[PDB]
Design a protein around this ligand. Structure first.
Ligand SMILES: c1cnc2c(c1)ccc1cccnc12
Length: 330
């Protein structure tokens, strides 16, 4: 079997992407953020504290004939940006673009932190990292991808994110018309539970490529590209007037400046991120200072190839016995 669904940016900056997901019988459609950096499928629900819901579509397990309370199971997640959510667990039928999984753990949120409440367009998250990161206690649960794996024609999912435009998430097959040239595959380490890989270097604009190993994670749930301080400093040194601002919390640049492109290595292949993709607009309404899409990972502890980098490529997440990541130009 296969699945194919369209993903759409939530705003004009591509801060996040939402993909419609059908949960329960009869179907309840919720717009979820597909996150390859986490492993919990959690949603806003009829059980969420009324004051913490601001416009989201909620899942109502009492209206689903296939919903089952997973007696005594609880979940609690604390994301990298200080955001958190927690609640109880149900099992229910979940479908993504025609691909159906029965008995998928659906984590019903009882409490959500304010940053989730503020994003009215995001109804929950669909975790696509490895199942060892799932927070369900006392019995850890499998991701949607892990549950679908046996049924898929091929144990892969692909991410084709658009720049200020809709894109596609495909499950079970590789669309050979969605990319140009060939796909370069690279090794994945699953030790921390992430799609962790090693980039072979980088270039700023039309400069010389610097061969250096950069260990990072392919993360669809992170908006920006977080790289070591040395790399980020070399990029922003090429932008007149760019500087690191502690009040803003990162590198900012004059909105009138033209940004150079950024190249990252995947084996012997090169993926070019156009400079326009690194512009995240004014820091505040009316400001002539703009926020950069390439930031330091020094305070994070891990390098993250977020939406800024992934949207410049066709990306294959190969969940075979020995997992790999594929990258192609598009
Ligand atoms: C991810 C993280 N921080 C940001 C954005 C996206 C977009 C705009 C912005 C403006 C000021 C400060 N941070 C951000």
């Amino acid at each position: 079997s296969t699945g194919s669904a369209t993903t759409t940016p939530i705003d004009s900056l591509d801060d996040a992407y939402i993909t419609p997901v059908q949960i329960g019988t009869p179907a309840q459609t919720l717009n979820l953020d597909f996150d390859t950096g986490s492993s919990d499928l959690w949603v806003f629900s009829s059980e969420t504290t009324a004051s913490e819901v601001d416009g989201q579509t909620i899942y109502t397990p009492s209206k689903s004939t296939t919903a089952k309370l997973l007696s005594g199971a609880t979940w609690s997640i604390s994301y990298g940006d200080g955001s958190s959510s927690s609640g109880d667990v149900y099992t229910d039928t979940v479908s993504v673009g025609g691909l159906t999984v029965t008995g998928q753990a659906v984590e019903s949120a009882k409490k959500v932190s304010s940053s989730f409440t503020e994003d009215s367009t995001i109804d929950g998250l669909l975790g696509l990292a490895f199942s060892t990161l799932n927070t369900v206690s006392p019995t850890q649960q499998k991701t949607f991808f892990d549950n679908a794996k046996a049924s898929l024609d091929s144990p892969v999912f692909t991410a084709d994110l658009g720049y200020h435009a809709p894109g596609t998430y495909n499950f079970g097959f590789i669309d050979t018309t969605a990319y140009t040239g060939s796909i370069t595959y690279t090794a994945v380490s699953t030790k921390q539970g992430f799609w962790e890989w090693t980039s072979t270097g980088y270039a700023v604009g039309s400069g010389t490529f610097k061969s250096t190993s950069i260990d990072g994670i392919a993360d669809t749930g992170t908006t920006l590209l977080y790289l070591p301080a040395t790399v980020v400093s070399a990029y922003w040194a090429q932008v007149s007037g760019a500087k690191s601002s502690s009040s803003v919390g990162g590198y900012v640049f004059p909105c009138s400046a033209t940004l150079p492109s950024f190249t990252f290595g995947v084996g012997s292949a090169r993926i070019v991120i156009p400079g326009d993709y690194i512009d995240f607009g004014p820091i505040s309404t009316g400001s002539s200072s703009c926020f950069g899409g390439i930031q330091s990972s020094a305070g994070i502890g891990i390098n993250i190839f977020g939406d800024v980098a992934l949207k410049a490529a066709f990306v294959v997440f190969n969940g075979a016995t020995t997992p790999t990541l594929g990258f192609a130009s598009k």
